[PDB]
Ligand binder design. Structure first.
Ligand SMILES: O=C[C@H](O)COP(=O)(O)O
Ligand SMILES: O=C[C@H](O)COP(=O)(O)O
Ligand SMILES: O=C[C@H](O)COP(=O)(O)O
Ligand SMILES: O=C[C@H](O)COP(=O)(O)O
Ligand SMILES: O=C[C@H](O)COP(=O)(O)O
Ligand SMILES: O=C[C@H](O)COP(=O)(O)O
Lengths: 257, 259, 259, 257, 259, 259
């Protein structure tokens, strides 16, 4: 999925628009967890029937969300044969102490992170992909920028440590194996891809996060609330592909409505 | 009641639906205390007439609630010959210092607990069953999860203690006999069953708490507020039974309707 | 009055219901102070005309209330020839430092207390009867329970003191003569009767307070706000008499209507 | 005015009811400073025209109010030939540091006090009469009780001091001459009369304050807001006169409406 | 302007009433800042056209207001040939650190002050007149009284200082030259006139402030909100003139109407 | 641009008014950010179509805004061939740690500053012009005044330092090269022009900021919300040109209508 865009969709017809626009994958969900999160409601796993109806409408991979720590929601979604599971902070947490033991599943997981310690704990638990936490539903890109900047800074700062005993102290505070931290410092990057997510609203935002070093982008239900969803979706895809070309970015950004 | 579901019911017709869906017992209550706790009202024992009309309508066991410390409410319910009494934090407490002396009744009691100390105090007073406190009426499973995790953890932490003097110190703080704590540490579990309660909303939630080591499940009035109550009740019963079979859990979770 | 129920009444016809239901006395009042507390109003002694009209309607004793420290309100009520005076915290206090010199009157007084020191000060001032304070008008029994439990706990705690000098120090702090405290510690009880009051809502509540050691029960205007006042009044009287009979308590508690 | 009742009145016809009921004096005022004090308004001296119209309607003495420290309001009221001036905390203060120099006037002044130090400062400034501050407009007698109890207690406590140097220390803290304090301690009372005021609502209240040692009572506009003002006014007068007679107090308190 | 009254006016017809009543000057303003200060609006210099239309309507001197620190607003008003400028705290401040350099203008300025230090800083900057700040729009005279009392008191307290080094210390804290402070202490007064302002509502209020040692009086838009504006304005003028004649003060205060 | 006025415009017809009134440049924007700040909305770069439509309407320079740190918004606006970019705090910031690397662009940038350290960091990053921050949309000039006064005060304070090591310590704290701070202390000014911005509401406000040492003036959408926009725009241009002429400032400030 490297270099691609993943789009949130709430109906089979929305999924078809995403596919036609050039999305790499879709995220199936029954409710927008930003509308009812401001209603006070509890947000859970979506009904397996609505997820299956979306799986049957497109040929590209389909992802679905589960609550933090809800390993039974994950068992059910795995049995449904989805392509990826997102253990998501946007839904209402089920366990405020323990995340899912992701290394007991065959299906790959994506998790959010806002700093280096969080990213490594999620990977140690078994995550196959990392993304920014951002701030979902607001359309403010600054959160996602903060998280990618912070991870990059913390890797460079640990690389300046000359004492192996000092490195071991850092790993202990992070609650991860010293061998995982040492691997990051040798490569100068996380062992898995890191995608942008939360508050990506415009084609310019998508290109900004790619220039900052992200491997792809997630976009939310904001796409389908615009005056012309097809045009906006297509523009975000083009901007992610051609992220280093100012003339193309100008072209796709003009007269968006 | 090991491995079963107990359902809150407010009418005789609701009790019949619970029985048909495969519930192991029903809890009789005249009003939902969660709906009242938002108005300032005092919530007490239900009228014995409404409890009896429910007892007359089903052949499965029937439970009823009393206020914390209200031993006369409990004497009345025992005389009515209900099957179990819940000394409940959801009702308005009658005594803020002392709980009921439960070992002086014939009928068994269930009590709530959030940690190991609280569980052991309720058992020492005479409780026959323990349950999580959770957060009643919210539909959020996370409080029930917190409580089962905490009890399990505090047992393991006390098992690491090498000094018998330190163990006696712990029991003193808990205000329980040292012999009760020692039995728990040797067995690795409470001496009575521990059920999930408060915030169980979906079949997946019921199976989650059974996988965490609960012995059964209490569910609330949310069942009867859904678009299809009999379908939801049956699905919760099936998930509590088949709690570690993923193909069955997918089957019962599909096309559930609006919760 | 011992073993009996005293009922608040606002009209002659309410007094007649109380008498027929088996009350031992009535308390005459022109306004429900709990209704007037919500209005921010000052609550005082009732008009002597309305009290006299109640006195003429029944052949059981009649009590009336006065503000804390208002010795002139008490002089007027004594001249009217009422049977007892309640120096009451439910009315708006008149003197925040000094209570009435009750030993200068011929008519007996009842006073409220929340702990042992308070009870002994009221007795030293001249009170003939003590009652719990509770929380008047809320229908929550927990405050009356707290007060009776406290007094009992403080007596037991003082009974553990070995030094007479230490006992003398406690009496000085309480502002009462040492001879009064000594009598209480020898006999394990107050020298006058102690009734339950404030927040007694159901027959079960009345029997609970009698089992905790109270000598009788005061009930408020909640009786006459229920669906069937005569039925509820009679049930509270029966529960106070038969407080240690679970089968009888079940009988009178069933099908009571809305409370 | 010893043993008498002074009544607040807002019209000439109200003044006539007060006189017929047996009042010793009336207090003339255009507005009730409890209604508009809860409206946020500034309360001042009343119009000299309305005061004169009341003076012309009755034969008994008439009093009027001025703001704390407003010595020009007092000059105007003195020129009008009223019988007494009340420098009153119920009106909006004009000077939050200095009270009126009352010893520069011919007309006598009444002032409020809540403790011994306050009472002596008001007398030192020139007051001819003291009254309780109470709490006006509320009908709660407890304030007035507090103030009479406090003055009595503080006199008795100073009388227990055996050192004349200790007495001088007390006077210095009170900001009054040592010879004024020493006079009080010798007599066991203030050198001027002390009346009850603020929150006197019923005949029982009036008798209570007289039994506590007050020399007379002030009553407010509550009288004229009752169902039967003539009956209530007459009952308060009888209760003040016969303050130590329970049978008479019962008689006047029955069927008041 | 010694011994006179200055009146706030919002139209040419209001200015004519002020002149006929005996005012010594008028203050031209397009809106009452007290009515706006409750809405959050920015209050600035008035439109020069409205100020000129007032100047054209009367033969007495005319004043106008500028924001604190706004020296260009002052340059515009000076070019218009108004008679006096008020650098006013009632308008929205333009500079929160620095006031206008008033000694660089030809037209005289008036400034507000709450204590001796503040008065001396305004004089050092070049003010020709001082006034109390009071509390504008409230009708409460007590703030104006506080300010005149404080200045008078702080002068007397500084006069008790026996050390010239201590005097220099005081001037340093005030941020003024020692020669300015010393002149005040020797004379027992400020080197310029000091007028009452903010909260003057009645004729008695005007005479009160003159008896306290003020040199004249500013009055606000309250004059024109009364039932009879010409009667009230005339009475305030007469009381400011005859400020220590009680028979005259009684005469002008009688039958004033609703304020 | 030096000595001139830059005006915010939301349509081609507004741009034409600005040009005819004598503006030196226009700032193109699709929404008034002050109106959108009240709505809680995110404010971003404007649509390139609306900017181009304004570019086609006038023959004076056109500027456009981007979010703080949003270097891709800046890349797009540069490709459009606008004349200047404003990296603006009035839009919703994109990067709360890092501003744009402005020296990597061909198009010049303007940035805001509230003190000397901030001004020098923006210049070191590559800014061609500095402006005050002020308080955008409120019409209160005091914040722009505060910022210009601060920068001047801090230059004078640093000029008093005798030690080169002390100067080096100040530069380290500011996070700028010592050579940049040294140049400012020698010449008594910034190396680039500094314009007034934020809260400039009247002609008098514009002239005030020019007299305080600003090089030119930015004005906001308040111009086009007044009764007569062309009249107000022309008056602000004339006041900026003739800032030290009191008779001219009186002329253009009179009879302006509602603001
Ligand atoms: O990834 C680096 C960005 O492109 C620019 O950020 P910077 O201000 O740290 O140079
Ligand atoms: O009972 C243990 C659970 O099934 C797994 O939880 P955990 O691995 O996060 O501790
Ligand atoms: O007065 C004793 C009560 O009946 C029971 O109280 P307890 O629970 O503390 O034993
Ligand atoms: O003035 C004394 C009162 O009549 C009674 O008050 P007391 O409680 O202090 O005795
Ligand atoms: O200027 C002094 C006043 O006229 C009187 O005030 P005072 O005696 O309270 O200090
Ligand atoms: O920049 C100097 C200003 O024009 C006047 O300021 P100032 O009042 O501090 O002298």
């Amino acid at each position: 999925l490297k270099g691609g865009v993943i789009m949130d969709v709430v109906t089979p017809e929305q999924a078809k628009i995403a596919e036609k626009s050039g999305a790499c994958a879709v995220m199936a969900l029954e409710s927008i967890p930003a509308d009812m999160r401001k209603s006070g409601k509890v947000c859970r796993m979506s009904d397996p029937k609505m997820i299956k109806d979306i799986m049957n409408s497109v040929s590209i991979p389909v992802m679905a969300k589960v609550r933090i720590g809800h390993f039974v929601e994950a068992q059910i979604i795995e049995a449904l044969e989805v392509d990826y599971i997102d253990e998501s902070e946007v839904l209402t947490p089920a366990d405020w102490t323990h995340h899912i033991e992701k290394d007991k599943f065959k299906v790959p997981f994506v998790c959010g992170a806002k700093d280096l310690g969080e990213a490594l704990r999620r990977i140690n638990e078994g995550a196959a992909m990392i993304r920014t936490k951002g701030e979902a539903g607001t359309g403010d890109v600054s959160e996602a920028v903060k998280h990618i900047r912070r991870i990059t800074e913390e890797i460079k700062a640990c690389q300046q440590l000359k004492s192996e005993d000092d490195i071991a102290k850092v790993a202990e505070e992070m609650r991860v194996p010293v061998s995982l931290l040492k691997d990051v410092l040798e490569k100068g990057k996380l062992p898995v891809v890191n995608f942008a997510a939360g508050g990506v609203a415009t084609p310019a935002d998508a290109a900004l996060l790619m220039q900052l070093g992200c491997d792809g982008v997630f976009v939310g239900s904001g796409i389908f609330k615009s005056s012309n969803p097809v045009r906006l979706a297509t523009a975000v895809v083009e901007a992610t592909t051609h992220f280093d070309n100012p003339s193309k970015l100008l072209e796709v950004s003009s007269d968006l409505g």
